[PDB]
Design an enzyme around this catalytic site. Structure first.
Site, PDB file in Angstrom:
ATOM      1  N   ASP A 140       0.812  -1.299   0.104  1.00 27.46           N
ATOM      2  CA  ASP A 140       0.116  -0.008   0.016  1.00 27.46           C
ATOM      3  C   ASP A 140       1.030   1.102   0.070  1.00 27.46           C
ATOM      4  O   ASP A 140       1.720   1.183   0.672  1.00 27.46           O
ATOM      5  CB  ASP A 140      -0.945  -0.061   1.275  1.00 27.46           C
ATOM      6  N   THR A 171      -2.958   6.703  -3.357  1.00 29.27           N
ATOM      7  CA  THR A 171      -1.769   7.805  -3.045  1.00 29.27           C
ATOM      8  C   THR A 171      -0.611   7.719  -3.943  1.00 29.27           C
ATOM      9  O   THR A 171      -0.121   8.480  -4.100  1.00 29.27           O
ATOM     10  CB  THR A 171      -1.359   7.616  -1.739  1.00 29.27           C
ATOM     11  N   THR A 172      -0.671   6.497  -4.482  1.00 33.05           N
ATOM     12  CA  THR A 172       0.565   6.306  -5.484  1.00 33.05           C
ATOM     13  C   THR A 172      -0.158   6.653  -6.951  1.00 33.05           C
ATOM     14  O   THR A 172       0.806   7.051  -7.755  1.00 33.05           O
ATOM     15  CB  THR A 172       0.790   4.828  -5.563  1.00 33.05           C
TER      16      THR A 172
HETATM   17  N1  LIG Z   1      -8.000  -4.900 -11.957  1.00 33.69           N
HETATM   18  C1  LIG Z   1      -7.133  -3.775 -12.446  1.00 33.69           C
HETATM   19  N2  LIG Z   1      -6.608  -3.743 -13.608  1.00 33.69           N
HETATM   20  C2  LIG Z   1      -5.793  -2.837 -14.249  1.00 33.69           C
HETATM   21  N3  LIG Z   1      -5.413  -1.809 -13.488  1.00 33.69           N
HETATM   22  C3  LIG Z   1      -5.944  -1.475 -11.920  1.00 33.69           C
HETATM   23  C4  LIG Z   1      -6.629  -2.779 -11.570  1.00 33.69           C
HETATM   24  N4  LIG Z   1      -6.997  -2.207 -10.413  1.00 33.69           N
HETATM   25  C5  LIG Z   1      -6.457  -1.127  -9.831  1.00 33.69           C
HETATM   26  N5  LIG Z   1      -5.647  -0.640 -10.888  1.00 33.69           N
HETATM   27  C6  LIG Z   1      -4.972   0.485 -11.096  1.00 33.69           C
HETATM   28  O1  LIG Z   1      -4.419   0.695  -9.753  1.00 33.69           O
HETATM   29  C7  LIG Z   1      -4.753   2.330  -9.629  1.00 33.69           C
HETATM   30  C8  LIG Z   1      -5.421   2.478  -8.151  1.00 33.69           C
HETATM   31  O2  LIG Z   1      -4.428   2.168  -7.521  1.00 33.69           O
HETATM   32  P1  LIG Z   1      -4.802   1.793  -5.806  1.00 33.69           P
HETATM   33  O3  LIG Z   1      -5.420   0.555  -5.799  1.00 33.69           O
HETATM   34  O4  LIG Z   1      -3.571   1.856  -4.761  1.00 33.69           O
HETATM   35  O5  LIG Z   1      -5.612   2.944  -5.165  1.00 33.69           O
HETATM   36  P2  LIG Z   1      -7.442   2.708  -4.926  1.00 33.69           P
HETATM   37  O6  LIG Z   1      -7.390   1.843  -3.846  1.00 33.69           O
HETATM   38  O7  LIG Z   1      -8.089   2.525  -6.250  1.00 33.69           O
HETATM   39  O8  LIG Z   1      -7.635   4.276  -4.266  1.00 33.69           O
HETATM   40  P3  LIG Z   1      -8.415   4.699  -3.272  1.00 33.69           P
HETATM   41  O9  LIG Z   1      -7.400   4.903  -2.036  1.00 33.69           O
HETATM   42  O10 LIG Z   1      -9.250   5.770  -3.579  1.00 33.69           O
HETATM   43  O11 LIG Z   1      -9.450   3.573  -2.899  1.00 33.69           O
HETATM   44  C9  LIG Z   1      -5.785   2.899 -10.696  1.00 33.69           C
HETATM   45  O12 LIG Z   1      -4.974   3.775 -11.323  1.00 33.69           O
HETATM   46  C10 LIG Z   1      -5.878   1.637 -11.623  1.00 33.69           C
HETATM   47  O13 LIG Z   1      -5.359   2.026 -13.049  1.00 33.69           O
END
Ligand SMILES: Nc1ncnc2c1ncn2[C@@H]1O[C@H](COP(=O)(O)OP(=O)(O)OP(=O)(O)O)[C@@H](O)[C@H]1O
Ligand SMILES: Nc1ncnc2c1ncn2[C@@H]1O[C@H](COP(=O)(O)OP(=O)(O)OP(=O)(O)O)[C@@H](O)[C@H]1O
Ligand SMILES: Nc1ncnc2c1ncn2[C@@H]1O[C@H](COP(=O)(O)OP(=O)(O)OP(=O)(O)O)[C@@H](O)[C@H]1O
Lengths: 506, 529, 509
Positions: free
Chosen positions: C46, C79-80
């Protein structure tokens, strides 16, 4: 061990000019300043730069001490001193390399300084109409809030306008001390408003929402276990002796809050923390309890109503209490605040509440609000307005060069350099906007040659041309330009008068 | 390992080859364009030559490095192919290497860069040839008069631009002759620009014919002749000698006298054969005898002596006559009748102030003319002659090559938008090869904007803002063929300004720069001995 | 240092913050090991967990941390995404700084290109409520399925997809991640993962008290204590040393009446069940078996924290303050035998907003890989019911914005052309790092994805499962439009705070 001995006094002031030259204008850059208590801060105000940057050269300390006199009698143009007087000492170095004496530049600067104080009343175009309207006030305040917080001036020009109109019937008493700023954490600047009276960010901890009592007492001590001013040897052995002190503490505090009810005081301010059992005793006798942990929030209340802060645990003293008309609670911006309103009095206290998510962002708005009040704190005097955006800086540089050309003698060299130091301020505005400064100065002198006055810089990255300041609504203060020219010339003549610095032991 | 030198491979020889090649581009960066800056060429002796022409810069530039030695040979492939273009190949190919060097750090093999560059080059010629202009509009429609007026603005002749631009437009169209199967080109020889003192610069006249700067001498001989025969000869009708260094021996004093009487008698025999041909126009380099001029004022032959040799080579080429070096035909003396004579219409001795000239009209095959630059002094006439010569070569080099293209930054700005949209149509690991090919072509307006003392972020972007609208919609409100006027710092249309470039200087520049960028990018190992 | 080289010193401190969270982009991203001063290791993928534990000392690097500090409190994650986007805005304008371009021109084009990114997203965002006449339960079962794809529970992924959509349905409109609990116990098959509607714990209480304590209750008074009821307890003991031998009988009896009077206050309050973090001895479970009272000690405090919020009570350490004001209430109280261990749980609370999902499996790595994917699948189905206007994830909205900001750049003359044209290439860090973190070829995917966007592909993105391109809008991989707007405006504002800084002032202290 000696090279020039007159150039090092000027180079120390040229470094002081460089820290605010790039920070000039609405397109000026911010400064990542570090506090002495190791706190990160982002600002662009010129007064907050010199407060944190502990400058050590005493030759450049004269301009800093001139900035403290620039903050007196006017609240406008601290960056004007560090740019214009810095251009005075930079242009004076080109004369000393020729062979001119330093005493010849001094008398030549004071000649052109008195000449510039006569051309400045000739450039007054508009004035305030004294209508006390929000349309007249916010039209002039939109230029002063610019170069502090660009882009968010549409919300700031209306809020300070609603505060200063409520003080203008009180003639001869308008000041920056009547308009206080209290910051509340929230969404942004769109949720900000303005209220009357003394408004604190902390709500009433008690259950009283409205009280009409006049007697207000402030106690800086927190509500805790009472300690006798004598020795007071209190010893406990068993559990029943501990309960005699526990029940005896609540019984003595019942008489402590009863002494506040005996003198007719239903408003109490506590600087420290309040216990939960002592909070119940305040709500029993209908006493409004407001917690204010800030020392500046406590010192503000002593200078308004006269209620002093006593170190003892609730002493019944009738002599050291304040007087207010109505203290109540109001829900503004999803946050209950306390209002020290004046209903019987006519009222001259206004509080602008600011909302925001970042404390580093809300502090820059506080410096933009207090500079907005200080613009109209000047306008309680004789109302004269000058065009801004470098419009008066070219016309003053045009008449002085026209005056110095016709005057014969050796004094014509220092008069010609007094006009070119005014040219650095449109050069500071053009450079910070990403525009070539040599093209804007040529475009400013071409339109001022034909008599088209009130022409300043067009604030745009893609457009290197100019525009009219009268139709754009850009207007500065003549008294803000009057004391800025006089104090910067008196500061730049002080650095040139001092030749060498010698350290001495006390 | 024990070898006969030092070995180095990897990407560090790729980064060292592009830093040595782009440093040569900085030698020819500021010297690009008509406002290019001079650069000092320090010799090993100690003297220095101040040259601003980029072709002479790379000839004298000696960098002992194999990456810089690759760019030395493309100057020899540029002048032998067309004759112009040279340093525009260098700035394009070095920026091609610098953008490809960023691709090596971005985990792209250069094999996709080499194959992507050849498809980006062939599509660049396709977009150029679909947006050309045929060589026409010579009369009636201006992109010419205004084309030569821009070249004439740097001198003092540019005060009256419309008066002097008409003298060079009709002179360029007069020297046109096909001569091979319908080629038409323009020769290296041009109109002879003479000068006189005609009390102002406004008394210049467009004479439709060659004008000789010689005076006929005597006045009793008539100055207006009607016959067509024109005689040209190089041998002197004066007293002849064997050699300037070899002499004949004369021993007896009376023997010296009879060879002078023979010289007076053999001059009577030669004039009988010249006037038997009917040739009145007599032009002699070596001079005419004093008693021989007595026979010409009674016969009516227009004899001119002390004529220059280089002027006579254009006169004999005008009437189609042959230059006779010696009158002796290896056993006797003859005049070579009906061989060294041409045809004409009218030769008038026009009264021109301080030099009475000889004009010839309607010769056999000349196509040349003359411009009499009448002025006030020698200062304004000498500067106006080089202004006419500089304006002649501008209109000449355009109207040769069989079709032209609006240049001056109009070619590379239009190619930066089409090749980017073409790059998104292919894919297959070559999209970044063509997309960086479009950004590498933008250095031609980028170096032209910094040499014109303008903002390079605004002047280049104003070129691409107009060229993008030609591809979005075909409406006429879109500005098309927008050139770059470096004088005022504002983009204008090249069709109205007349700024044109040949197609072979634009096609072979993009062809040679990509083949030079391919050869340096194929270097992955260094071996020294 | 003022001018150009102060910005270069701030643009290099931006790289060391982005490189700490560059490989963590995506569900299959690499983990990071952060070790504090005490010697404890922290493995997490994370991005908000890493940035909270770095504590960087650089002043220009503290700006990008505090932007991510505001992002986790309002939105919750991502955050990334706001860190790599704010970093790539600077690396494209970095060769334009040394050319002599003013940093205010970087500000004036960042405010323009951000507003074009908002207008393009809202014109392309499609509201998916009842598309193609499907049930809303089947829509969350497909979107949570792609979150569990290419995992260790792909053999029974249809069963685990129904478990996430049942847990989000049992809560109210106030959805949150911390209200759902995930337990990890060893043993059993993979398909034996049951669901609990309320709060359950492992119940390691292995003391006496059997053949009593009826497990059924209609409306019990849930007691929450932190007292120890053991015979050899550390807080309930009596040690009186004397010579008197009939006082020797008294010190053993009065030590028992200390525990007896503390147990008598429990039954006087009327509590049916009692809970305690400290263990309960055998003589206290014997006393509750005589008066027909249920008792279950040795419960964790974190399991009690979800219990007091649901039951409506509060935790009281002492037994004197036990009254009806702190006793919780529930409607269903049963006992199961899941996995061979005893499990106590409450169902039907008046404030029933919390649940617990028990995991089963034969290996601990088969459980920790799922709970990383389970918390992501919970926030996906949470965002689906919250925001109906969604767009395709996986870099599909980033490649569409790179197309819209490229041709609009060629229509704007001036210094905004070469900057907003570089702003379009700066948004390519999201589909590019999805290929390198998944181990694919970033060259062949991005060249095929940008060629698909020119022909008409508006929803094609990077597939993290296969090395292909696919329509993420049709593959049920979605992200809300309002989160993508809030991630784009925060990235340009954080990139503005590094560019607008021109000089650093350090007070001598
Ligand atoms: N199943 C997937 N296939 C392709 N890309 C994905 C997938 N799941 C997440 N991503 C990529 O990961 C990024 C999101 O990263 P992360 O999961 O760390 O944040 P998040 O949990 O979505 O955000 P939040 O904190 O608002 O819930 C998105 O920009 C997306 O492009
Ligand atoms: N948008 C603008 N249009 C025209 N002139 C401007 C503008 N912004 C600033 N100026 C010019 O800048 C000078 C004052 O600018 P500025 O607001 O930076 O000073 P200040 O910050 O108010 O001074 P202090 O530091 O004491 O607050 C005036 O001469 C004014 O003409
Ligand atoms: N009339 C014109 N108006 C505007 N730009 C021009 C004009 N003529 C030429 N140029 C520009 O000037 C450049 C030519 O530069 P220069 O003549 O200094 O060297 P060069 O001819 O390119 O070198 P080489 O002889 O190898 O090709 C061309 O790139 C062209 O864009």
């Amino acid at each position: 061990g000696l090279e020039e001995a007159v150039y090092r006094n000027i180079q120390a002031c040229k470094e002081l000019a460089q820290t605010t030259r790039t920070a000039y204008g609405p397109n000026g850059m911010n400064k990542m300043v570090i506090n002495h208590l190791e706190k990160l801060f982002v600002t662009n105000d010129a007064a907050t730069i010199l407060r944190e940057l502990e400058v050590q050269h005493p030759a450049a300390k004269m301009i800093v001490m001139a900035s403290h006199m620039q903050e007196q009698e006017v609240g406008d143009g601290t960056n004007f001193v560090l740019v214009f007087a810095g251009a005075l000492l930079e242009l004076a170095e080109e004369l000393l390399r020729i062979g001119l004496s330093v005493s010849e530049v001094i008398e030549g600067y004071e000649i052109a300084c008195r000449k510039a104080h006569e051309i400045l009343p000739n450039l007054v175009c508009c004035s305030a109409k004294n209508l006390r309207d929000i349309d007249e006030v916010s039209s002039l305040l939109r230029t002063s809030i610019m170069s502090k917080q660009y882009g968010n001036e549409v919300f700031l020009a209306k809020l300070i306008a609603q505060a200063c109109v409520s003080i203008f019937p009180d003639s001869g008493h308008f000041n920056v001390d009547n308009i206080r700023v209290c910051k509340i954490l929230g969404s942004g600047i769109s949720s900000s408003s303005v209220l009357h009276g003394m408004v604190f960010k902390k709500e009433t901890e008690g259950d009283v929402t409205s009280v009409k009592d006049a007697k207000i007492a402030v106690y800086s001590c927190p509500f805790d276990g009472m300690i006798t001013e004598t020795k007071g040897t209190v010893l406990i052995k068993t559990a029943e002796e501990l309960m005699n002190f526990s029940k005896g503490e609540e019984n003595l505090m019942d008489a402590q809050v009863k002494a506040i009810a005996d003198t007719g005081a239903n408003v109490v301010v506590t600087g420290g923390k309040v216990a939960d059992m002592a909070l119940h005793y305040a709500n029993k006798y209908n006493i409004m309890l407001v917690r204010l942990n800030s020392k500046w929030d406590l010192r503000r209340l002593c200078k308004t109503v006269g209620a002093t802060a006593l170190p003892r645990l609730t002493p019944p003293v009738l002599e050291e209490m304040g007087h207010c008309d109505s203290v109540y609670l109001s829900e503004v911006g999803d946050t209950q605040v306390v209002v020290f309103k004046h209903e019987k009095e006519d009222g001259a206290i206004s509080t602008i509440v600011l909302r925001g998510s970042t404390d580093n962002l809300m502090d820059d708005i506080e410096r933009a609000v207090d500079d907005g009040v200080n613009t109209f704190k000047v306008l309680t005097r004789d109302k004269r307005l000058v065009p801004g955006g470098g419009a008066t800086e070219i016309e003053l540089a045009k008449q002085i060069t026209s005056y110095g050309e016709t005057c014969p003698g050796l004094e014509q060299y220092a008069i010609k350099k007094f006009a070119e130091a005014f040219e650095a301020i449109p050069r500071a505005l053009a450079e910070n906007s990403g525009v070539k400064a040599n093209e804007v100065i040529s475009k400013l002198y071409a339109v001022h040659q034909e008599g088209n006055k009130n022409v300043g810089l067009d604030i745009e990255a893609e457009v290197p041309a100019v525009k009219d300041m009268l139709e754009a609504g850009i207007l500065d203060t003549y008294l803000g330009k009057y004391w800025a020219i006089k104090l910067a010339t008196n500061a730049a003549v002080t650095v040139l008068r001092v030749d060498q610095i010698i350290m001495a032991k006390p | 390992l024990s070898v006969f030198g030092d070995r180095s491979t990897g990407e560090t020889i790729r980064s060292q080859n592009v830093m040595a090649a782009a440093s040569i581009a900085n030698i020819v960066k500021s010297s690009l364009g008509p406002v290019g800056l001079d650069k000092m060429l320090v010799d090993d002796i100690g003297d220095v030559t101040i040259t601003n022409d980029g072709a002479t810069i790379l000839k004298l530039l000696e960098v002992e490095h194999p990456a810089a030695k690759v760019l030395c040979e493309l100057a020899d492939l540029q002048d032998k192919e067309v004759g112009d273009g040279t340093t525009s190949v260098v700035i394009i190919a070095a920026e091609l290497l610098k953008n490809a060097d960023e691709l090596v750090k971005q985990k792209i093999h250069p094999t996709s860069v080499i194959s992507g560059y050849r498809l980006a080059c062939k599509e660049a010629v396709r977009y150029i040839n679909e947006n050309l202009i045929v060589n026409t509009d010579e009369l009636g429609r201006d992109c010419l008069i205004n084309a030569a007026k821009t070249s004439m603005s740097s001198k003092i002749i540019g005060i009256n631009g419309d008066f002097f631009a008409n003298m060079v437009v009709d002179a360029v169209l007069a020297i046109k002759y096909t001569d091979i199967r319908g080629q038409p080109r323009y020769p290296v020889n041009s109109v002879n620009i003479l000068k006189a003192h005609g009390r102002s610069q406004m008394e210049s006249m467009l004479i439709s014919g060659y004008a000789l700067n010689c005076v006929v001498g005597s006045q009793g001989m008539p100055k207006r002749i009607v016959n067509a025969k024109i005689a040209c000869l190089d041998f002197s009708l004066q007293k002849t000698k064997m050699k300037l260094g070899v002499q004949v021996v004369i021993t007896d004093p009376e023997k010296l006298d009879q060879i002078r009487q023979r010289e007076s008698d053999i001059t009577k025999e030669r004039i009988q054969k010249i006037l038997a041909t009917g040739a009145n126009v007599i032009l002699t380099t070596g001079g005419i005898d004093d008693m021989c001029l007595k026979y010409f004022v009674e016969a009516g032959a227009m004899a001119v002596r002390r004529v220059l040799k280089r002027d006579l080579k254009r006169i004999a080429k005008a009437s189609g006559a042959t230059i006779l070096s010696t009158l002796a035909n290896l056993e006797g003396e003859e005049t070579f009748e009906a061989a060294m004579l041409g045809q004409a219409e009218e030769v008038v001795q026009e009264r021109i102030c301080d030099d009475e000239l000889i004009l010839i009209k309607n010769t056999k095959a000349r196509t040349s003319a003359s411009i009499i630059l009448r002025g006030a002094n020698d200062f304004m006439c000498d500067e106006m002659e080089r202004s006419l010569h500089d304006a002649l070569c501008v209109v000449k080099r355009v109207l040769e090559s069989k079709s032209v293209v609006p240049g001056g930054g109009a070619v590379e700005a239009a190619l930066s938008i089409y090749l980017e949209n073409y790059a998104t149509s292919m894919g297959s690991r070559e999209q970044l090869a063509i997309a960086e090919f479009a950004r590498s072509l933008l250095v031609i307006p980028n170096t032209l904007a910094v040499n014109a003392a303008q903002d390079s972020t605004d002047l280049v972007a104003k070129l691409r803002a107009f060229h993008n609208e030609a591809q979005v919609n075909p409406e006429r409100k879109n500005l098309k063929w927008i050139g770059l006027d470096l004088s005022n710092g504002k983009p204008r249309d090249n069709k109205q300004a007349g700024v044109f470039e040949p197609t072979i200087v634009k096609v072979k520049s993009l062809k040679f720069a990509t083949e030079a960028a391919i050869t340096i990018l194929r270097i992955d190992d260094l071996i020294k001995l | 240092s003022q001018g150009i080289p102060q910005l270069v010193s701030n643009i290099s401190a931006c790289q060391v913050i982005a490189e700490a969270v560059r490989t963590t982009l995506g569900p299959r991203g690499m983990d990071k090991l952060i070790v504090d001063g005490r010697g404890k290791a922290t493995i997490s993928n994370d991005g908000a967990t890493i940035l909270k534990l770095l504590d960087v000392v650089h002043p220009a690097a503290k700006t990008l941390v505090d932007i991510a500090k505001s992002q986790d409190a309002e939105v919750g994650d991502g955050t990334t995404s706001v860190t790599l986007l704010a970093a790539e805005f600077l690396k494209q304008v970095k060769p334009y700084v040394e050319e002599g371009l003013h940093p205010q021109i970087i500000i004036r084009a960042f405010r323009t290109a951000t507003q074009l990114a908002v207008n393009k997203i809202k014109e392309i965002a499609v509201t998916v409520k009842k598309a193609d006449k499907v049930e809303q339960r089947k829509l969350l079962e497909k979107c949570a399925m792609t979150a569990l794809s290419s995992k260790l529970i792909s053999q029974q992924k249809a069963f685990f997809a129904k478990m996430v959509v049942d847990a989000v349905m049992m809560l109210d409109d106030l959805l949150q991640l911390k209200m759902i609990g995930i337990k990890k116990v060893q043993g059993g098959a993979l398909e034996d993962s049951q669901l609990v509607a309320g709060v359950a714990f492992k119940k390691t209480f292995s003391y006496a008290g059997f053949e009593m304590q009826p497990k059924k209750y209609h409306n019990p008074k849930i007691a929450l204590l932190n007292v120890e009821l053991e015979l050899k307890a550390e807080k309930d003991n009596a040690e009186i040393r004397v010579h008197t031998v009939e006082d020797y009988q008294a010190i053993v009896d009065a030590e028992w009446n200390i525990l007896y009077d503390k147990l008598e206050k429990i039954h006087h309050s009327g509590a049916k069940v009692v809970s305690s973090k400290l263990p309960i001895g055998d003589v206290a479970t014997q006393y509750f078996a005589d008066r027909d009272m249920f008792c279950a000690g040795r419960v964790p405090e974190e399991d009690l924290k979800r219990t007091m919020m649901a039951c409506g009570g509060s935790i009281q350490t002492s037994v004197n303050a036990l009254s009806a004001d702190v006793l919780g209430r529930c409607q269903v109280f049963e006992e199961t035998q899941i996995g061979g261990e005893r499990y106590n749980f409450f169902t039907g609370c008046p404030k029933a907003k919390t649940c617990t999902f028990i995991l089963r499996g034969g290996a601990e790595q088969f459980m920790e890989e799922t709970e990383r994917s389970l918390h992501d699948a919970i926030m996906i189905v949470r965002r689906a019911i919250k925001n109906d206007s969604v767009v395709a994830g996986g870099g599909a909205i980033e490649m569409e914005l790179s197309k819209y900001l490229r041709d609009y750049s060629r229509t704007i003359p001036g210094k905004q052309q070469l900057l907003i044209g570089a702003y379009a290439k700066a948004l390519e860090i999201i589909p590019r790092q999805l290929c390198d973190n998944a181990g694919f070829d970033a060259t062949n995917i991005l060249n095929k994805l940008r060629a698909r966007h020119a022909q008409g592909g508006t929803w094609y993105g990077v597939d993290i499962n296969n090395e292909d391109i696919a329509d993420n809008f049709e593959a049920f991989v979605w992200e809300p439009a309002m989160v993508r707007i809030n991630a784009l405006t925060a990235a340009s504002e954080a990139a503005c705070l590094i560019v607008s800084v021109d000089e650093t002032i350090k007070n001598p202290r």
